[PDB]
Amino acid sequence: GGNYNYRYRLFRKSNLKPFERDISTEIYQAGSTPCNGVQGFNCYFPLQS
Amino acid sequence: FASVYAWNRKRISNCVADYSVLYNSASFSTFKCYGVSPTKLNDLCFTNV
């Protein structure tokens, strides 16, 4: 049936640092316009299964 | 201009092109492009436009 429950951060504002855990989930800005928590166009999901 | 079935094609190359005037110009209503970010056209440097 698939273990798609595992998820990995795909989109981040910038690079991480050694020893940083990332659990915060937010609409990711994929362009030059505000997102306002709506995943339509130029605003994507940070994590991917 | 010409009609859509006979649309007019123009070549632009080997020049320094000002896109800020087009963006800020209030005469134009639609500047609507998303694969090309509307703000940094000057940054976008190409050939045979």
From Swiss-Prot, chain A:
* Known outcome of mutating residue 32 to N: In strain: 20A.EU2, Iota/B.1.526, Omicron/BA.1, Omicron/BA.2, Omicron/BA.2.12.1, Omicron/BA.2.75, Omicron/BA.4, Omicron/BA.5, Omicron/BQ.1.1, Omicron/XBB.1.5, Omicron/EG.5.1
| Effect on the protein of changing residue 48 to R | In strain: Omicron/BA.1, Omicron/BA.2, Omicron/BA.2.12.1
Region (Immunodominant HLA epitope recognized by the CD8+) location: 3-11
Record region (Receptor-binding motif): 1-49
- Look up what happens after changing residue 11 to L: In strain: Omicron/EG.5.1
Quick one: effect of changing residue 48 to Y? Reduced host ACE2-binding affinity in vitro
| Name of this protein | Spike protein S1
Which source organism does the UniProt entry give? Severe acute respiratory syndrome coronavirus 2 (2019-nCoV)
Query: What range of the parent protein does this fragment cover?
Result: 446 to 494 of 1273
